[PDB]
Amino acid sequence: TLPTVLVAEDHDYDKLILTEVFARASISADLRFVSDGEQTLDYIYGRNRFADRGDAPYPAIVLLDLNMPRLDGRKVVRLLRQDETVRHLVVIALSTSESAKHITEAYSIGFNAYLVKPANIADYVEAIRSLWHFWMNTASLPTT
Amino acid sequence: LPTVLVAEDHDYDKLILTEVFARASISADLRFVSDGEQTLDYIYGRNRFADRGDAPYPAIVLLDLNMPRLDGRKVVRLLRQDETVRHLVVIALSTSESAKHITEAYSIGFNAYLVKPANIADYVEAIRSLWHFWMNTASLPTT
Question: How many contacts, defined by CB atoms under 8 Å, are there between A and B?
Fold first, then answer.
């Protein structure tokens, strides 16, 4: 009965990397990968492939990879924030971009936080340790 | 130095948070304001904070939800509906551990919610963690 982490990520290497990062950070979590914005929203709103809420539990936190081609991040997060039923969800952007313009746009749009993807597994392990410590141990997360 | 805007009016809580930052070895400019008007005046650069040089844009905002003259919902709903400031990172602080209160804060638009720790030592570990994540791990937006 581990916390579920919903991750929008379609790249096979990035999936491998993040799976490895969570294992090496010694984090116990249920990583659920989805490949586009439709599947992300279907997971959140419990539609279609994720109608059964028992096989696909509400996410404790959502990570969206902004470098993924078939994810319209602005469209996904603006929907989420304008909808009173889901607007509490913690959603964090992941991106290779270090542009202050991109970073600020993500916050403006409604992401809780933005992380620049670290350059190697070791550094990514420190970042996810930090993210997990804060969101899971220090802060209190909302409940659906 | 980064400016941390803090809505807090209680003399003891101000003392505690000042001490917590010093003990956490954090270098930051803590700016305390005593009500929602002064908080919004700081963010929007009005009146007592018209001169932006004397009152720099906050890197992060902490609102104490136990403060009587703070209407948190009103402050954060204004901030989120205004495209000029809606990027600001705002974190709720509260003694309340109610899941209903916690969820309402997120629903309203807070980036995160922290239950106030019970003593200076625990508060030091919490602020160390908050600072590590928001300042070292995440990238904060720029005004």
Answer: 92
